[PDB]
Amino acid sequence: EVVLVNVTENFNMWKNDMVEQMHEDIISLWDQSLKPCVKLTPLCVGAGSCNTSVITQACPKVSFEPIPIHYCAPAGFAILKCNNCTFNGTGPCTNVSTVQCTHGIRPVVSSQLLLNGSLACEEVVIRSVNFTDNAKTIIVQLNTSVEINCTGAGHCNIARAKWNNTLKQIASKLREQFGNNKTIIFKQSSGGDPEIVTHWFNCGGEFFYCNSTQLFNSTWFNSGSDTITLPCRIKQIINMWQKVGKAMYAPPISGQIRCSSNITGLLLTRDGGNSNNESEIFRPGGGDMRDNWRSELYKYKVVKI
Amino acid sequence: DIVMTQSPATLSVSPGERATLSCRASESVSSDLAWYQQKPGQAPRLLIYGASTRATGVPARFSGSGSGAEFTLTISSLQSEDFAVYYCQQYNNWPPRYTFGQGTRLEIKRTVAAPSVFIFPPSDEQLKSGTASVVCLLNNFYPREAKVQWKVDNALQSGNSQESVTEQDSKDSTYSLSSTLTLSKADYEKHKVYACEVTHQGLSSPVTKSFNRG
Amino acid sequence: KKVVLGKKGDTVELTCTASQKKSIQFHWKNSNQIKILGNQGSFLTKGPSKLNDRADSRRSLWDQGNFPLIIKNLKIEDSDTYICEVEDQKEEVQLLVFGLTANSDTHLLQGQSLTLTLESPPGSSPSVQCRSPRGKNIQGGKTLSVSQLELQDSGTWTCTVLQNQKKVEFKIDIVVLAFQK
Amino acid sequence: EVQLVESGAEVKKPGSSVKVSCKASGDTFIRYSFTWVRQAPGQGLEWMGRIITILDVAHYAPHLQGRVTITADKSTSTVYLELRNLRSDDTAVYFCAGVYEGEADEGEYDNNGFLKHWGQGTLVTVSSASTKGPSVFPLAPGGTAALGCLVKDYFPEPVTVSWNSGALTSGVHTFPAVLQSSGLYSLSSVVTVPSSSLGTQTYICNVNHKPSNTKVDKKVEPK
Ligand SMILES: OC[C@H]1O[C@@](CO)(O[C@H]2O[C@H](CO)[C@@H](O)[C@H](O)[C@H]2O)[C@@H](O)[C@@H]1O
Ligand SMILES: *[C@@H]1O[C@H](CO)[C@@H](O)[C@H](O)[C@H]1NC(C)=O
Ligand SMILES: *[C@@H]1O[C@H](CO)[C@@H](O)[C@H](O)[C@H]1NC(C)=O
Ligand SMILES: *[C@@H]1O[C@H](CO)[C@@H](O)[C@H](O)[C@H]1NC(C)=O
Ligand SMILES: *[C@@H]1O[C@H](CO)[C@@H](O)[C@H](O)[C@H]1NC(C)=O
Ligand SMILES: *[C@@H]1O[C@H](CO)[C@@H](O)[C@H](O)[C@H]1NC(C)=O
Ligand SMILES: *[C@@H]1O[C@H](CO)[C@@H](O)[C@H](O)[C@H]1NC(C)=O
Ligand SMILES: *[C@@H]1O[C@H](CO)[C@@H](O)[C@H](O)[C@H]1NC(C)=O
Ligand SMILES: *[C@@H]1O[C@H](CO)[C@@H](O)[C@H](O)[C@H]1NC(C)=O
Ligand SMILES: *[C@@H]1O[C@H](CO)[C@@H](O)[C@H](O)[C@H]1NC(C)=O
Ligand SMILES: *[C@@H]1O[C@H](CO)[C@@H](O)[C@H](O)[C@H]1NC(C)=O
Ligand SMILES: *[C@@H]1O[C@H](CO)[C@@H](O)[C@H](O)[C@H]1NC(C)=O
Ligand SMILES: *[C@@H]1O[C@H](CO)[C@@H](O)[C@H](O)[C@H]1NC(C)=O
Ligand SMILES: *[C@@H]1O[C@H](CO)[C@@H](O)[C@H](O)[C@H]1NC(C)=O
Numbered sequence A: 001e002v003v004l005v006n007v008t009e010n011f012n013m014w015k016n017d018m019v020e021q022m023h024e025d026i027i028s029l030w031d032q033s034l035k036p037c038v039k040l041t042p043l044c045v046g047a048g049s050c051n052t053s054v055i056t057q058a059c060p061k062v063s064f065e066p067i068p069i070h071y072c073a074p075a076g077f078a079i080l081k082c083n084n085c086t087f088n089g090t091g092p093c094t095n096v097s098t099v100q101c102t103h104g105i106r107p108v109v110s111s112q113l114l115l116n117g118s119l120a121c122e123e124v125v126i127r128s129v130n131f132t133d134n135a136k137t138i139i140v141q142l143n144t145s146v147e148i149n150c151t152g153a154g155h156c157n158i159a160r161a162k163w164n165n166t167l168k169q170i171a172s173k174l175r176e177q178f179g180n181n182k183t184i185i186f187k188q189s190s191g192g193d194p195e196i197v198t199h200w201f202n203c204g205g206e207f208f209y210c211n212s213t214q215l216f217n218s219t220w221f222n223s224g225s226d227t228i229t230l231p232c233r234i235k236q237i238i239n240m241w242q243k244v245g246k247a248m249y250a251p252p253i254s255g256q257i258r259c260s261s262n263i264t265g266l267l268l269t270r271d272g273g274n275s276n277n278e279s280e281i282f283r284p285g286g287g288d289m290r291d292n293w294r295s296e297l298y299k300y301k302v303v304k305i
Numbered sequence B: 001d002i003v004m005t006q007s008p009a010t011l012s013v014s015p016g017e018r019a020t021l022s023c024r025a026s027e028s029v030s031s032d033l034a035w036y037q038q039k040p041g042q043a044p045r046l047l048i049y050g051a052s053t054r055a056t057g058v059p060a061r062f063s064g065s066g067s068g069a070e071f072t073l074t075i076s077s078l079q080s081e082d083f084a085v086y087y088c089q090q091y092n093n094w095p096p097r098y099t100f101g102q103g104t105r106l107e108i109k110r111t112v113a114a115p116s117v118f119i120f121p122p123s124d125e126q127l128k129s130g131t132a133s134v135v136c137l138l139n140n141f142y143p144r145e146a147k148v149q150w151k152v153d154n155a156l157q158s159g160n161s162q163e164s165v166t167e168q169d170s171k172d173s174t175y176s177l178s179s180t181l182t183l184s185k186a187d188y189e190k191h192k193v194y195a196c197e198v199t200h201q202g203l204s205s206p207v208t209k210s211f212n213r214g
Numbered sequence C: 001k002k003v004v005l006g007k008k009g010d011t012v013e014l015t016c017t018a019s020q021k022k023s024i025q026f027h028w029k030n031s032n033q034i035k036i037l038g039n040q041g042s043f044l045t046k047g048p049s050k051l052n053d054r055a056d057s058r059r060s061l062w063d064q065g066n067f068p069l070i071i072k073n074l075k076i077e078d079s080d081t082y083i084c085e086v087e088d089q090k091e092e093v094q095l096l097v098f099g100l101t102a103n104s105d106t107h108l109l110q111g112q113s114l115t116l117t118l119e120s121p122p123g124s125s126p127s128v129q130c131r132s133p134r135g136k137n138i139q140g141g142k143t144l145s146v147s148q149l150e151l152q153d154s155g156t157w158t159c160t161v162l163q164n165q166k167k168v169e170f171k172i173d174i175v176v177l178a179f180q181k
Numbered sequence D: 001e002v003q004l005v006e007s008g009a010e011v012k013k014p015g016s017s018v019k020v021s022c023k024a025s026g027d028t029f030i031r032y033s034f035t036w037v038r039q040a041p042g043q044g045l046e047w048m049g050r051i052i053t054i055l056d057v058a059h060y061a062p063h064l065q066g067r068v069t070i071t072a073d074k075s076t077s078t079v080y081l082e083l084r085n086l087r088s089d090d091t092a093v094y095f096c097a098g099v100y101e102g103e104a105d106e107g108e109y110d111n112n113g114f115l116k117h118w119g120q121g122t123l124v125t126v127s128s129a130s131t132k133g134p135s136v137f138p139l140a141p142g143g144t145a146a147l148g149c150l151v152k153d154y155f156p157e158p159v160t161v162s163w164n165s166g167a168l169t170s171g172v173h174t175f176p177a178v179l180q181s182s183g184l185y186s187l188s189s190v191v192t193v194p195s196s197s198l199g200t201q202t203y204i205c206n207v208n209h210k211p212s213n214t215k216v217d218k219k220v221e222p223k
Helices: A017-033 A160-178 A289-297 B124-128 C059-064
Strands: A009-012 A038-041 A053-056 A077-082 A090-093 A096-099 A113-115 A125-127 A138-151 A155-159 A183-186 A199-203 A206-210 A218-220 A227-235 A237-239 A246-248 A258-270 A279-284 A300-304 B004-007 B010-013 B019-025 B033-038 B045-049 B062-067 B070-075 B085-090 B104-108 B116-120 B131-141 B147-152 B161-165 B175-184 B193-199 B207-212 C002-007 C012-014 C026-030 C035-040 C043-046 C069-071 C080-086 C089-102 C114-119 C127-131 C137-140 C143-146 C155-163 C166-174 D003-006 D010-012 D018-025 D032-039 D045-052 D057-060 D068-073 D078-083 D092-100 D122-126 D135-139 D144-154 D160-163 D172-174 D185-194 D203-209 D214-220
Touching (some): A009 A300, A017 A300, A113 A138, A113 A199, A125 A160, A138 A289, A155 A160, A155 A206, A160 A183, A160 A218, A160 A227, A160 A279, A258 A289, B010 B019, B019 B033, B019 B085, B019 B104, B045 B062, B085 D045, B116 B193, B116 B207, B124 D135, B131 B193, B131 D144, B131 D185, B147 B161, B147 B175, B161 D185, C002 C012, C002 C166, C012 C089, C089 C155, C089 C166, C114 C127, C114 C155, C137 C143, D003 D092, D010 D018, D018 D032, D018 D092, D018 D122, D032 D068, D045 D068, D078 D092, D144 D203, D144 D214, D160 D185
Parallel strands (some): B010 B104, C002 C089, D010 D122
Antiparallel strands (some): A009 A090, A125 A138, A138 A155, A155 A227, A183 A218, A199 A206, A206 A227, A237 A246, A258 A279, B004 B019, B019 B070, B033 B045, B033 B085, B062 B070, B085 B104, B131 B175, B147 B193, B161 B175, B193 B207, C026 C035, C035 C043, C080 C089, C089 C114, C114 C143, D018 D078, D032 D092, D068 D078, D092 D122, D135 D144, D144 D185, D172 D185, D203 D214
């Protein structure tokens, strides 16, 4: 809205209460919108007997299509916005402005790939709270979207040439961060919950679990092609993202479930570990949806006025 | 709660002919409707689910139809093994409160057969024990419908007899029936003639079998 | 400095507790910084360690501020130092896995020998004490042998392994045959 | 495909509880949901409840809520039904039944409400009556004659009847038992035979009542 002349402001995308606010809002959105037939949540406080909370409820088959949310200043506060395209998300920003509201953000719940989001305006950007810590998630922001077309018939398609181009740019940014002499390797998820190990998302109100091995199986700066086809599974028994628990939904009713999304970013983790080897391994990650919100909110902060 | 109604209660069909059974729901159950077959002494057997899908091992003469609130089971040519009780089951609601129809009994239609009637006085060993059971047997008749009345000294009896009826005979398609009159030894000795009076489509007039006590 | 002893083939549970009863981000690593297991929000992740297919947590305790590392079917090489990183803090635990076997799983004769072998990880200095049903005591470090079995030695032997002040108990069934003179 | 084998018949006083079981063999236990259905003598099928085995979550018929519990033991592939505060009208054959739900361990679940596999049923008799064997009385004997045995005052069901140790089956009718006002059961077994055969052929009814460990043989003669 209006630029602040000669003003330097510190941003920290990893400690941003806008992220926490958005998170609670999406959890509430899902309560009123995507209701399971049965949901289970653990309760073990007595230290001698557990009592799982079980809720059974009406379970309507409904279309689910995320629409943009705009966050405007909460009472007593103001929203500041960092204008530097390449801003890492943590540190001083010299080009800051005040805005009435954020840009429109679609609250897509997904793992591994970030979908239907904003693209970087210059080069590919990577962000972490601590790059040296192998346990911390790396948020990648692409500067060019990649289409992924999915069907309820059990697969997602991605153009192989575009994906390769994308991987090359990511690896080049990763070696820029971890060493120019490093070989960059992408591998499949090392394990965990199904929602974590596959690229997991919802389409037509159904939960898709697609095998992403073919997307993360290459080596960079070391020395059926046209389309990559990922096998998918639609499931009814789902681990909850909102909190520890499980939900069960009814089977699909539509024989024509079709979605096409733009991949605009990804979530990766680095293997790390003690090694004199001159290579780094990166695997798809995600699961904490706050990282999804961060990927869009990194350039904003709210300040007391 | 969803009420399932089947009709008719009993269906009589001649061997090798077609049978059509009906099931109605008190509200729509979409296609969440199953049909089961049950023979005496055995567990039910699934024939049809999803209103029209045949379960494994079910022959093609069984076909299910309908949706919403009205359903039909058709058996195109009845074989010996198809005579049984048939149940429909609603499973559309959530939370689940699944319900069954009250069943349709499919039995073999044959020509009328009048019963042979036999009467049995109480044994001396039972009389010795202070009670008297008089047994009336109606043997090998068709149709199942029969009326049995007890008269003691021409006095029409009520509330002191019980009946039991066999399953339809696998060889000749008939039924048999017993009616047992029970009275104390004291009441038994206070009367003379004990008579069983039987009415049935196959009899031109009521048949009476009797004996004089002592 | 916390030391936990495990038995080969058994399950073990390593504890990690945060300051408050609430599910937060945690991660378990070994001494070479290899990722074992952690959470991402309310989902479990597993790292590229050799424990992968045998490691788990108990998510029903996460909301209570407990984030355990459970390792099933323990192997000798699972012995290591494990670190749980939670709320900017690091809790460390050394796991030592031991195995104890008899020379023969088949039945022995009176007067025949029994040899027990302790399988242990590199760098452990364990002492062992075994006791037969009759009260026969044998002590050793890696190998313990009785030269002549008595008939009264048939049954369950109880073996205690001592390491770092801590001890773990093995029970081994031995058969010694009777005969008619 | 699963095979379902249920536990044996039960006899209970009103006010008691009962726990019946059903062992599932032959397929992956957690890929099935299991349902209990009861059938009172001479009546139709009544749905009692169903357990989603993988989730360990059971739902019940409204008229039963509160006094029925359905459980499953995955380690023994066994499903249980408990019914508390029993009433005489709980007397019925209780059936365990199940259906395949898809790869539940992989998150696939069709939630099928129909029932493909059935146990053999378990009779549960609920009554104030005490166990007792029958008294057996002759129904003493025209080209064809009728004769039989009256099997009276036993509890509980069932009783079995044969003639001449199983050598005679043609023309035999063993009627379904009736429950007398005394709370005890009664039935007759009859057989039609050539009238010329009386006095030359001997007829014995064999009555077996397993619940009371009782076995009776009764010669039925002309006079
Ligand atoms: O439990 C009542 C409930 O079950 C139904 C069948 O769905 O009736 C069943 O149970 C009755 C009581 O035991 C029986 O008389 C009947 O034969 C049996 O079908 C419904 O009537 C009702 O919703
Ligand atoms: C801002 O910076 C410019 C150039 O560095 C300088 O001339 C000016 O004094 C500063 N202050 C403002 C508010 O213009
Ligand atoms: C917890 O739920 C169970 C149902 O399985 C119940 O038996 C128990 O009494 C409950 N305890 C509490 C906290 O009321
Ligand atoms: C971004 O990253 C670098 C190190 O990666 C950090 O030192 C800098 O202050 C951060 N802020 C900017 C200027 O983007
Ligand atoms: C990003 O910001 C830094 C300092 O915050 C500034 O030096 C630089 O001009 C910016 N980079 C751009 C415009 O890409
Ligand atoms: C701040 O960034 C905006 C947009 O990126 C740009 O228009 C402007 O030149 C920057 N401010 C200055 C004057 O450095
Ligand atoms: C995207 O970024 C890469 C480097 O990260 C750069 O080479 C490429 O030109 C950028 N693409 C566009 C369309 O700006
Ligand atoms: C960053 O991660 C490294 C590797 O685990 C760790 O040693 C270091 O303490 C971390 N830095 C901060 C500031 O947390
Ligand atoms: C995805 O669909 C779009 C049109 O909706 C098409 O242009 C694109 O080529 C598709 N990408 C694939 C199948 O890789
Ligand atoms: C990506 O894969 C393509 C084949 O699809 C291959 O030519 C190339 O080695 C990779 N990218 C580049 C241009 O290095
Ligand atoms: C994905 O597919 C690959 C290749 O077939 C397979 O090795 C891997 O185990 C699969 N991953 C999952 C999550 O099933
Ligand atoms: C990974 O790619 C290699 C060659 O680039 C291929 O041979 C292999 O099948 C792929 N791995 C998996 C697990 O699919
Ligand atoms: C991305 O946007 C497209 C077009 O509006 C939509 O069809 C698709 O469902 C979106 N993807 C997700 C995962 O929401
Ligand atoms: C993805 O982005 C491309 C280029 O901006 C656009 O043409 C296409 O419609 C987008 N797809 C979706 C689903 O938004």
